[PDB]
Amino acid sequence: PEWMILEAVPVLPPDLRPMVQVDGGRFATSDLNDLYRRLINRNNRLKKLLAQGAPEIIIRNEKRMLQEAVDAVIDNGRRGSPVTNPGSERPLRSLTDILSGKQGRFRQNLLGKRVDYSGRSVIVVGPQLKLHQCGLPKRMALELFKPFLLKKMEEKAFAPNVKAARRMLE
Amino acid sequence: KEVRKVRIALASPEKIRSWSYGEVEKPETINYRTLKPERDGLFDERIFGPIKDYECACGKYKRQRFEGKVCERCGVEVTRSIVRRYRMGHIELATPAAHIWFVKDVPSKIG
Amino acid sequence: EIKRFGRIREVIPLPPLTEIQVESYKKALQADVPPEKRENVGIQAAFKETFPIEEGLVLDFLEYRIGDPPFSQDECREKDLTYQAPLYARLQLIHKDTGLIKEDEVFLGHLPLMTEDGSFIINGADRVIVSQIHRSPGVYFTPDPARPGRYIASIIPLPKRGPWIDLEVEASGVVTMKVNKRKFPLVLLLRVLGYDQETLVRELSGLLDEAVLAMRPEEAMVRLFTLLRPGLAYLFGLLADPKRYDLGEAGRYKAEEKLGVGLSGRTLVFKDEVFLPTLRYLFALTAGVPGHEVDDIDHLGNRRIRTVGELMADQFRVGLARLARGVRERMVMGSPDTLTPAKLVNSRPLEAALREFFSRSQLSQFKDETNPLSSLRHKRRISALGPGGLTRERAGFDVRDVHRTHYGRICPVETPEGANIGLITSLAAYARVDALGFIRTPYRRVKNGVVTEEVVYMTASEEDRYTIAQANTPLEGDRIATDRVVARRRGEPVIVAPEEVEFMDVSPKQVFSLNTNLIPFLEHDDANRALMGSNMQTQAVPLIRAQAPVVMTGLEERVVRDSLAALYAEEDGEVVKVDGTRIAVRYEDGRLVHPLRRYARSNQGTAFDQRPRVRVGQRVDLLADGPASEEGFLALGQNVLVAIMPFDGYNFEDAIVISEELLKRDFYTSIHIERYEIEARDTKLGPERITRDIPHLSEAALRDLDEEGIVRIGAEVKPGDILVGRTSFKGEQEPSPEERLLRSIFGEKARDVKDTSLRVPPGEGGIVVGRLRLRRGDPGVELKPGVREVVRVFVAQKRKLQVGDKLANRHGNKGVVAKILPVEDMPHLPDGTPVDVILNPLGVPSRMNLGQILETHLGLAGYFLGQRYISPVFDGATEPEIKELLAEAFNLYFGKRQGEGFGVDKREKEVLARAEKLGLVSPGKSPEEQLKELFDLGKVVLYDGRTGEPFEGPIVVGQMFIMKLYHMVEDKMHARSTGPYSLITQQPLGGKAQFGGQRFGEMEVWALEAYGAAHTLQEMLTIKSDDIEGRNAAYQAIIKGEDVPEPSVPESFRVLVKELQALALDVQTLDEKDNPVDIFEGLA
Amino acid sequence: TSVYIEDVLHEFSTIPGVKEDVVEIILNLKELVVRFLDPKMASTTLILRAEGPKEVRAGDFTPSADVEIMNPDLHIATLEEGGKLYMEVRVDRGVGYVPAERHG
Amino acid sequence: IRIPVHMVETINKLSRTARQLQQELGREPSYEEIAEAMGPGWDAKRVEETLKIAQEPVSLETPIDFIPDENLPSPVEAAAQSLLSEELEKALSKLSEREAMVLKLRKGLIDGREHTLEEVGAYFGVTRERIRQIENKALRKLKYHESRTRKLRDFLE
Amino acid sequence: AEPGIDKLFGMVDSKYRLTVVVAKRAQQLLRHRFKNTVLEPEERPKMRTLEGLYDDPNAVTWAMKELLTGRLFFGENLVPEDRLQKEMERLY
Ligand SMILES: [Zn+2]
């Protein structure tokens, strides 16, 4: 029943994202962190705000902060913790509506993945050889096959080392 | 080897520290009013405090390191997290809490 | 060729639309008018309705002042800055001794504007507001959907300004008033309102069954506060600010006619005002006689169209308050050195709650200035969507059975779409004049020179529907009139002496918007066909060539003009000019030069030009063309020939077939301008700039074209072609190993400034209408702080029409180029002329029916007959018309040949054979007569540039209309390979060059596993997805050569794991037989 | 196949004292045809001292022979005081249709 | 991130100052225009450096994985890496140990030790003399074999 | 569809099991040295494209067509998945 808690455990990688320009805006930051903070600050202010003898009342009212502060990284499901505080707005991405939730990360990277030689195009039709046959535009195509493309170009004329290859597709 | 049955479930606080391994606590300066990166407390690169001049001891071999100031052959330049997991320790020792204990009356309520 | 058809034209197309717009700016926004008049309305109100923010210590609100735009137009578009126009407002403070300091309007802040045009300008992005509607104030009562227990439903002043009261008729409490967010014994209310027992009961009216609480005028005061927010009576009635409805109608004139009589300026001011006229009524309403419990039922006599002059100005109140209790925090802190009616009111919380509006307030729908029209429509469109409560996609609680049709002809029923359907459309021509300020009002006719339009509410005395007549009086004897909704036969009111209090469509078109009354036989197709048309027109393209349709409605007399596409005039006349770019003047008020366009940027590509017309002196009254235009005749597409039938099915399902000649005379082509924003901030590690001395890669490929950074105008560009080469110091990945074995091997030493350039996106071969440079510290440069330079070069592209773009006509027929033909082929008319365009039936003709076609036959009476025509709606242009017209036509055509060389040929004749056996031609005179008929409706012979035979069958042909919408191809395509490769996501979506994607998310999956594409299915989530190493394992794999690229190793999952382990979990990637236990990933 | 002007940078760009507009211009130049005496001639050039106010049309170019212009009137320009126009058009002889690919 | 009373008390300044000049001008004053409002050392660059760090911006964090981008461990790059290397191994096939290894250790290709020419001279007996010649003996014999057989494209990576 | 495809699907225990076999005797096939398939003379498919010809580098199709020569079996045979490389020397 180690469900009682004494050591939340947040990672750090996902956040340290930095400056995005073009069109009309730049500046850059992340969430879960500023969301995380909530914690440590409290759990830090507690200790140094007790050691200096903070009798009753105070003590609990604080400490508990951690508690509430914990229902942070976890699930924002009660009164909310909007950013822009006071801020009457958005919901802190606390594994709710996002990450683990539905259609945010889980419902996303389970199937909502991505090919890498994918692509798209319009639509046509018209007698060819029908079946097994397909439109596909010279260029457009190419890339999809760019890899081997080089390869065949190897031993068989075209070019020498694949080194170049793309060097010719410029 | 080759994957199979996928286990999971708890990992008592005793465990926290296991993965936690170390690293954490302290403050979380989301950068300095100056040189953006680091802070020597938060997303601080594990054992990276301006010029710790250490930590590279844990690593057996592979390549050189220890460049005094700035940064050595650490992760900060390459292999930094490598999208891998990195656990934080949290200093958390204060009273209690609750991993949400969900919304079905378990890990309490019933017991 | 002014072939007039439309009989009896009276009123003019409500001169001139573009009201909803201005209607806000001005009629609602006093401003450029004395500081004395205009009751409250929009801004004048708020100010007073905004109590002089209390703490002596008393501020004051006195008079405004505006105009004086610090940045005149154009300038702004050369940069950004909305064409905002700052104001101020004198503020004298009150307090203790000699309380006054009447400061200089307290030099407030700026506020954007509206160009006469009929739209808005923001950060150089001419955008648009758009209207909002909603159940309008008064009282409803509503029809108890729960269990037949008729109650009531009280209004709000407007959304953002009041509580929603209700008075139930339940059981476990006979009437539980519902205060906005609440529910309680309404009886516990009236008590604390003087009227309690004896004073209210037996005078008017489950009653006081709880009369126990009808004793003291304060009982519930508190007693009530105990059940609301946590365990209020300042607002909700008392005073004026919350529960206060006004303006002059509904907000006010709600009771005065519906409740009985005895208005106020709110309700329950605690001296009750309406809480009596409401229940008194439901009491003599439920069971009594006065029914008229006519629920909104969406009826427009209960709905409100709101001109933006209340859309933001409302929120204006809420802002000049986000400053009230923002300044009150100023009357406490900061000694008097720092205290004055000029040291609190700061332009930091006001302009904000407004700029954070026009720029991203949804509705704003960055104007769709595509063609000249579309745009306009936006200035209309109209929606109950936005911030007012009627909102989201695909329902709340109810939305499907709701905003359906209605009882408002003052609106087209063919404009929405299919998704967030209904909740979007557009007003109509004759609609909203004089009092549009509250509830729509369509014009009406009354037999002679008089007019009325008491809203789209007039449902008393019925009306006629423009049909049959003769100098004020017809003879139908069965007046095709209308009552409310049904369509009773008639009852000719009797006296030409005015209509039955209003009766006459006044004109046909009045029923539809505008984006409608412009399609040919728009009385001959399914509604949804048209629909899928009255929106296609929303997306045209300046084919530069333009044409103005053989068929059409002179409404184009407006379309252009009132949208100010082309230009106009002024009193006197006589030109002179230079033409080139500018235009001569006039005579009246002296000379007057005249700018134009120069292609210019549109908000998507249009690139609008303005070639002109003239030569010497003529003043009616036009002046210089429009983008998509011809002599005032709103031209949009290119009406080349056409002809039903199939051909090698190169028109299956629903496709079109073009003829290369449709390129020869560059008929179909256009242009689009993409602004390319490229910057160079400057950290402190690396400083980014633009020296044309690009590193590493030095070649003629650069120095010749670019040079000194910027590239001269008139330079052809292709994919990857540097647009504004640049540098950046930057040292991210320092010196390589073996690489050194090269940096010298060839001796190109080393570099020191990562290439960082622009290089044209994936693909956009084009030209250059110019460039543009910018920089910090400059007076006019409103760049983002911490930066310098904001290169912004322009490029447009002489489009074309390859193989894929959408064509579509005016009656619903989306093209999709098949395989344009090289002359030789085609349908060679007996006289050479091949059929430039085809359009095989099936698809929507037989299917989802239409009429158009009459736009084909009558059509041929064009390339031949030589005249163009005007075809009104629900009037003129009919099945016999074309005949009388098809007439002289044949004699004509057949004429030539019969007097030129031939008359009847084996082929041309033979066919006629079947023509009979077929069940068409009558066995008459020589091939002449018969060959004729075929004409009339059907089309003359025709052969085939393929075999050369004839086309056994009275084929059909006739120049019509071809549009070629926006959805091109070179713009709607993204092909690639590895290209992306994004981080954090570790999944495709990354490239300072590329930028594609392609989801496989769900479904796409399923269908695949539906078979055994294991190695292929897994393949996705494996290498070609997020196997990282796997990634490289790939390219390398094949790049190298043969080999079943590596097995696999997920990742996004590896993420979830930790992502999960985030919380108190674990993920023993448990192995085989329990005890093996695998936790793979942990280093490798 | 290939034109030019002088004070004009590119196609999608205007010309002073010229209502036409480059686009327009070529879009009128396109339908101009000619004939070439001799088979040697691979393709020649044409000029035009289009000056000051006037009407401006085909036969107002180089009075060269060897290549006659079976198109007279052919409304080419329209300048009114913005005199200036001297241009370098390159006529070709081929077989078919060949737009923006064969840059003369 | 970190706010000593070095910026808040100063940002409140330019803020109250910009709001100060505001009511007494009519338009949002520029940056340099504020310089005078302030004083010594307060030019424009510094007035811009401050309101460039923070006050409460640092984005709102995540509206709309609100932003993409990338280039960390470039996929195609890490693939064009093994090539150049394995490519050199081949381009080094037509070399002599008394030059190949000489290069390896020299430029530091063997492992990563950019040994000086002395370390290369010690182990490799003979003093720099013939060695220095072997050094340049390479380059040419390494570049000469290029213009006649492409490979001058590996430089772009 | 597939050349002879009809002689496949049935001549097995069920769809997949077929496709399966195929893509193995492919890499294993050509990818393990072009000269390996069972076919002998010209029955070995070709690609008479432009002016010149050559065996379709798309190995995958050999196997399909290779399953038309009595040769080759399929099933739990020779458990040494490794020893499939026991030939990896006899064919170099
Ligand atoms: Zn170090």
Swiss-Prot record, chain A:
Superkingdom per UniProt: Bacteria
Job description of the protein: DNA-dependent RNA polymerase catalyzes the transcription of DNA into RNA using the four ribonucleoside triphosphates as substrates.
Similarity remark: Belongs to the RNA polymerase beta' chain family.
Subunit (UniProt): The RNAP catalytic core consists of 2 alpha, 1 beta, 1 beta' and 1 omega subunit. When a sigma factor is associated with the core the holoenzyme is formed, which can initiate transcription.
Name of the featured protein: DNA-directed RNA polymerase subunit beta'
Organism in which the protein naturally occurs: Thermus aquaticus
Full protein stretch here: 509 to 678 of 1524
Swiss-Prot record, chain B:
Organism the protein comes from: Thermus aquaticus
Family from the record: Belongs to the RNA polymerase beta' chain family.
Subunit structure: The RNAP catalytic core consists of 2 alpha, 1 beta, 1 beta' and 1 omega subunit. When a sigma factor is associated with the core the holoenzyme is formed, which can initiate transcription.
Coiled coil (UniProt feature): none
Binding positions for Zn(2+) 1 per the UniProt entry: 56, 58, 71, 74
Source taxon at top rank: Bacteria
Organism classification: Bacteria, Thermotogati, Deinococcota, Deinococci, Thermales
Record function comment: DNA-dependent RNA polymerase catalyzes the transcription of DNA into RNA using the four ribonucleoside triphosphates as substrates.
Descriptive protein name: DNA-directed RNA polymerase subunit beta'
Interval of the full protein contained in this chain: 3 to 113 of 1524
UniProtKB/Swiss-Prot annotation, chain C:
Enzyme nomenclature, EC number: 2.7.7.6
KW Nucleotidyltransferase (keyword) present: yes
InterPro entries: DNA-dir_RNA_pol_bsu_ext_1_sf (IPR042107), DNA-dir_RNA_pol_bsu_external_1 (IPR019462), DNA-dir_RNA_pol_su2 (IPR015712), DNA-dir_RNAP_su2_dom (IPR007120), DNA-dir_RNAP_su2_hyb_sf (IPR037033), RNA_pol_bsu_bac (IPR010243), RNA_pol_bsu_CS (IPR007121), RNA_pol_bsu_protrusion (IPR007644)
UniProt xrefs under Gene3D superfamilies: 2.40.50.100, 2.40.50.150, 3.90.1100.10, DNA-directed RNA polymerase, beta subunit, external 1 domain, DNA-directed RNA polymerase, subunit 2, domain 6, RNA polymerase alpha subunit dimerisation domain, RNA polymerase Rpb2, domain 2
Pfam families: RNA_pol_Rpb2_1 (PF04563), RNA_pol_Rpb2_2 (PF04561), RNA_pol_Rpb2_3 (PF04565), RNA_pol_Rpb2_45 (PF10385), RNA_pol_Rpb2_6 (PF00562), RNA_pol_Rpb2_7 (PF04560)
Oligomer and partners: The RNAP catalytic core consists of 2 alpha, 1 beta, 1 beta' and 1 omega subunit. When a sigma factor is associated with the core the holoenzyme is formed, which can initiate transcription.
Protein name from the UniProt record: DNA-directed RNA polymerase subunit beta
Curated annotation (Swiss-Prot), chain F:
The protein, known as: DNA-directed RNA polymerase subunit omega
Record bears the keyword Nucleotidyltransferase: yes
Gene Ontology annotations for the cellular component aspect, listed alphabetically: DNA-directed RNA polymerase complex
Similarity comment: Belongs to the RNA polymerase subunit omega family.
Source organism per UniProt: Thermus aquaticus
Reactions accelerated catalytically: RNA(n) + a ribonucleoside 5'-triphosphate = RNA(n+1) + diphosphate
Record keyword Isomerase present: no
Molecular function (Gene Ontology), one example: DNA binding
UniProt feature coiled coil, ranges: none
Highest taxon, organism lineage: Bacteria
SMART domains: RNA_pol_Rpb6
Pfam families (alphabetical): RNA_pol_Rpb6
Self-association and partners: The RNAP catalytic core consists of 2 alpha, 1 beta, 1 beta' and 1 omega subunit. When a sigma factor is associated with the core the holoenzyme is formed, which can initiate transcription.
GO BP terms, alphabetized: DNA-templated transcription
Residue ranges crossing the lipid bilayer per the database entry: none
Keywords, comma-separated and alphabetical: DNA-directed RNA polymerase, Nucleotidyltransferase, Transcription, Transferase
Physiological role: Promotes RNA polymerase assembly. Latches the N- and C-terminal regions of the beta' subunit thereby facilitating its interaction with the beta and alpha subunits.
UniProt-listed Enzyme Commission number(s): 2.7.7.6
